[PDB]
Amino acid sequence: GAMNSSNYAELFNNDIKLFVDDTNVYRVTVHKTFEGNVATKAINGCIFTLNPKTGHLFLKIIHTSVWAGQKRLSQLAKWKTAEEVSALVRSLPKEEQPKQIIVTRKAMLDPLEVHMLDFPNIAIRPTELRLPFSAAMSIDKLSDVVMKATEPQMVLFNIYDDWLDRISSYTAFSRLTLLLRALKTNEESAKMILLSDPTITIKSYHLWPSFTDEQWITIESQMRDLILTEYGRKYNV
């Protein structure tokens, strides 16, 4: 069943698995109409599909055109997400297909299960973890490709850059979740921490700056401090 603190190491074993996050699929700005009513305008979204072992990110861009003339968009977004994940699994060679898909929100279970009936051997699982994947649109290069898209498009990234050359998946995923947790709690602060020293740049083929092992430790400490401060503020403790 559900993925939790107890079965955490399973993410880094040799069974292919993908996380699916649908939180940035259907995005709107709410505005006033001339008559003073409220309306939404959809903006481009994305499905965040991640192999936590390899760092391979299957970023499916959701162009606003998919919502044209559709009703109940927040319900349709779960089904569109399941349709796109299913199409991705079918496009992969058999030996690359996942054995499990873990959805970050329980509302994705039935839509994915129904789309994947052809794949009875692929287990669809929820999680107890409160993963910060919603903050993926706070990564500048991912935000840039989503907002510039003029049509449906799939873009492949490695969300760990070259870290697996130096650290284990376990350590790479903990670093990723700490960066995204910080970006989600205080985006401006998190982004200042990452880019303040202009001598450390982001390679053209990377998402994150080229920190040495020592600089990652300092960065990781600043992100921890950011998170706990905001927690004392949120909760006056």
């Binding site: 349709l76 349709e83 839509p111 299960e113 129904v114 789309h115 009936l117």
Partner: peptide, 16 residues
């Protein structure tokens, strides 16, 4: 309700 008998390919959301 979650069987191929119940769900036509390409009408997943509609049939469910």
């Amino acid at each position: 309700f979650k069987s191929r008998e119940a769900i036509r390919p390409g009408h997943e959301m509609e049939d469910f």
